Enzyme design. Structure first.
Site, mmCIF file in Angstrom:
data_model
loop_
_atom_site.group_PDB
_atom_site.id
_atom_site.type_symbol
_atom_site.label_atom_id
_atom_site.label_comp_id
_atom_site.label_asym_id
_atom_site.label_seq_id
_atom_site.Cartn_x
_atom_site.Cartn_y
_atom_site.Cartn_z
ATOM 1 N N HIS A 42 0.837 -1.290 -0.192
ATOM 2 C CA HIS A 42 -0.077 -0.145 0.017
ATOM 3 C C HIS A 42 0.903 1.315 -0.089
ATOM 4 O O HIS A 42 0.273 2.495 0.071
ATOM 5 C CB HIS A 42 -1.084 -0.090 1.111
ATOM 6 C CG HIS A 42 -0.313 0.377 2.590
ATOM 7 N ND1 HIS A 42 0.542 -0.622 3.156
ATOM 8 C CD2 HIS A 42 -0.422 1.459 3.205
ATOM 9 C CE1 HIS A 42 0.948 -0.003 4.221
ATOM 10 N NE2 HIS A 42 0.453 1.438 4.367
ATOM 11 N N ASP A 88 -0.675 -7.580 1.406
ATOM 12 C CA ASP A 88 0.082 -6.305 1.242
ATOM 13 C C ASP A 88 1.647 -6.556 1.407
ATOM 14 O O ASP A 88 2.221 -6.581 2.257
ATOM 15 C CB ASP A 88 -0.253 -5.530 2.577
ATOM 16 C CG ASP A 88 0.528 -4.094 2.824
ATOM 17 O OD1 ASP A 88 1.632 -4.150 2.837
ATOM 18 O OD2 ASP A 88 -0.199 -3.155 2.771
ATOM 19 N N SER A 185 5.432 2.289 7.586
ATOM 20 C CA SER A 185 4.767 1.293 6.593
ATOM 21 C C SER A 185 5.789 0.784 5.995
ATOM 22 O O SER A 185 6.655 1.400 5.345
ATOM 23 C CB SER A 185 3.663 1.847 5.749
ATOM 24 O OG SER A 185 2.603 2.603 6.634
ATOM 25 N N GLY A 186 5.934 -0.538 5.308
ATOM 26 C CA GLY A 186 6.875 -1.211 4.672
ATOM 27 C C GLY A 186 8.023 -1.448 5.505
ATOM 28 O O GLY A 186 8.983 -2.469 5.158
HETATM 29 O O1 LIG Z 1 -6.141 4.096 12.102
HETATM 30 C C1 LIG Z 1 -5.327 4.369 11.214
HETATM 31 C C2 LIG Z 1 -3.575 4.801 11.384
HETATM 32 N N1 LIG Z 1 -2.722 4.878 10.198
HETATM 33 S S1 LIG Z 1 -1.233 4.989 10.242
HETATM 34 O O2 LIG Z 1 -1.136 5.890 11.927
HETATM 35 O O3 LIG Z 1 -0.610 5.840 9.303
HETATM 36 C C3 LIG Z 1 -0.484 3.521 10.617
HETATM 37 C C4 LIG Z 1 0.576 2.819 9.656
HETATM 38 C C5 LIG Z 1 0.962 1.633 9.764
HETATM 39 C C6 LIG Z 1 1.108 0.896 11.016
HETATM 40 C C7 LIG Z 1 1.942 -0.335 11.302
HETATM 41 C C8 LIG Z 1 1.659 -0.796 12.543
HETATM 42 CL CL1 LIG Z 1 2.463 -2.531 12.731
HETATM 43 C C9 LIG Z 1 1.023 -0.640 13.876
HETATM 44 C C10 LIG Z 1 0.345 0.851 13.775
HETATM 45 C C11 LIG Z 1 0.358 1.462 12.328
HETATM 46 C C12 LIG Z 1 -0.448 2.911 12.084
HETATM 47 C C13 LIG Z 1 -3.172 3.941 9.212
HETATM 48 C C14 LIG Z 1 -4.755 3.952 8.717
HETATM 49 N N2 LIG Z 1 -5.517 3.895 9.772
HETATM 50 C C15 LIG Z 1 -7.101 3.403 9.623
HETATM 51 C C16 LIG Z 1 -7.351 2.137 9.004
HETATM 52 C C17 LIG Z 1 -6.358 0.854 9.351
HETATM 53 C C18 LIG Z 1 -6.727 -0.323 8.314
HETATM 54 N N3 LIG Z 1 -8.098 -0.594 8.069
HETATM 55 C C19 LIG Z 1 -8.400 -1.951 7.547
HETATM 56 C C20 LIG Z 1 -9.567 -2.031 6.481
HETATM 57 C C21 LIG Z 1 -10.061 -3.634 6.150
HETATM 58 N N4 LIG Z 1 -9.156 -4.790 6.643
HETATM 59 C C22 LIG Z 1 -8.376 -4.672 7.514
HETATM 60 C C23 LIG Z 1 -7.967 -3.256 7.996
HETATM 61 C C24 LIG Z 1 -9.201 0.604 7.953
HETATM 62 C C25 LIG Z 1 -8.943 1.823 8.935
#
Ligand SMILES: O=C1CN(S(=O)(=O)c2ccc3cc(Cl)ccc3c2)CCN1CC1CCN(c2ccncc2)CC1
Ligand SMILES: [Ca+2]
Lengths: 235, 51
Positions: A42, A88, A185-186
């Site tokens: 992503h 992903d 991410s990544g």
């Molecule tokens: O709450 C957030 C936080 N960020 S982050 O801070 O940049 C961010 C980015 C990477 C991270 C990686 C880790 Cl290991 C922990 C926290 C993180 C925080 C990413 C996007 N979201 C909301 C979305 C989260 C995923 N989701 C689904 C949909 C369908 N099936 C499954 C999951 C919908 C709403």
């Protein structure tokens, strides 16, 4: 990286950063070989054109050991699904081979069976990046490294709000203020064994950043191991 | 036999194949003479923090 420590010289040599045209780091990545960088699929959406950067630990000075490489081809996993974040994962092919020096070394790839058995059953896992230190804060300027303990596959599924598919696992703290975050991410999730680290997860997704009752979901590298192989010959 | 006692006494990958245990290493190493430890073959082995 919410909480966690700070990577010192040579501590996190397999890290890699994905920078945009504005030369800002938008994502992370792991170095597999002189030519391939691993990364979250992503991440290939927040920047038209980009480049991979290695050997950097302070985005504002100059340790002199940095390096900005260009992407020849970006291998994305065909079955990726934004809507769900399943499958992903992607691999990048560098036009110019990576020159391993201090603060620049590849991370080993485990053997799937051996991994899920010995690696994925260790108490903790190393996650790192140049990402937000706070849920609503700015992005990191120093290369960070937290120590995320492995979560129980089930607690994990219950704490969720979305479905943790076959291709992803949980890691982090229930209440402890330590998690990854935006920009991570990544990023690499290595597991240590007898003083040697193995790639076992790609910073995937999470609900908030270190939220109580919420965990960190990474991409289960062990599963896509056959994929990562024939992808390192492009496919 | 049993890559479960202490990883078969292997430095890395271990395989319970048939009876006795069989060790092996990441790409870039070589199995030592005793058949357990993994020795680097190049300047910057993977998994090792640079010094
Ligand atoms: O709450 C957030 C936080 N960020 S982050 O801070 O940049 C961010 C980015 C990477 C991270 C990686 C880790 Cl290991 C922990 C926290 C993180 C925080 C990413 C996007 N979201 C909301 C979305 C989260 C995923 N989701 C689904 C949909 C369908 N099936 C499954 C999951 C919908 C709403
Ligand atoms: Ca720098």
């Amino acid at each position: 990286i919410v909480g966690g420590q700070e990577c010192k010289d040579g501590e996190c040599p397999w890290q890699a950063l994905l920078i945009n045209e504005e030369n800002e780091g938008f994502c992370g990545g792991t170095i597999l070989s002189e030519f391939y960088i691993l990364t979250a699929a992503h991440c290939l959406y927040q920047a038209k054109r980009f480049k991979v950067r290695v050997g950097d630990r302070n985005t504002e000075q100059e340790e002199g050991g940095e390096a900005v490489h260009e992407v020849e081809v970006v291998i994305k996993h065909n079955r990726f699904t934004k809507e769900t974040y399943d499958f992903d994962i992607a691999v990048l092919r560098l036009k110019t081979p990576i020159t391993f020096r201090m603060n620049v070394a590849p991370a080993c790839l485990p053997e799937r069976d051996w991994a899920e058995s010995t690696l994925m059953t260790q108490k903790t896992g190393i996650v790192s990046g140049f990402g937000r230190t706070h849920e609503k804060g700015r992005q990191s300027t120093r290369l960070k490294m937290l120590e995320v303990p492995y979560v129980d596959r089930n607690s994990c599924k219950l704490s969720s709000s979305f479905i943790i598919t076959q291709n992803m696992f949980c890691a982090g703290y229930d209440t402890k203020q330590e998690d990854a975050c935006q920009g991570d991410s990544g990023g690499p999730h290595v597991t240590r064994f007898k003083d040697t680290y193995f790639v076992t997860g790609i910073v995937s997704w999470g609900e908030g950043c270190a939220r109580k009752g919420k965990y960190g979901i990474y991409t289960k590298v062990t599963a896509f191991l056959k994929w990562i192989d024939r992808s390192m010959k492009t496919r | 036999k049993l890559c479960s006692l202490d990883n078969g006494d292997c430095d890395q990958f271990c395989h319970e194949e048939q009876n006795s245990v069989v060790c092996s290493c990441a790409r870039g190493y070589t199995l030592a003479d005793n058949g357990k430890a993994c020795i680097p073959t190049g300047p910057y082995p993977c998994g090792k923090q640079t010094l």
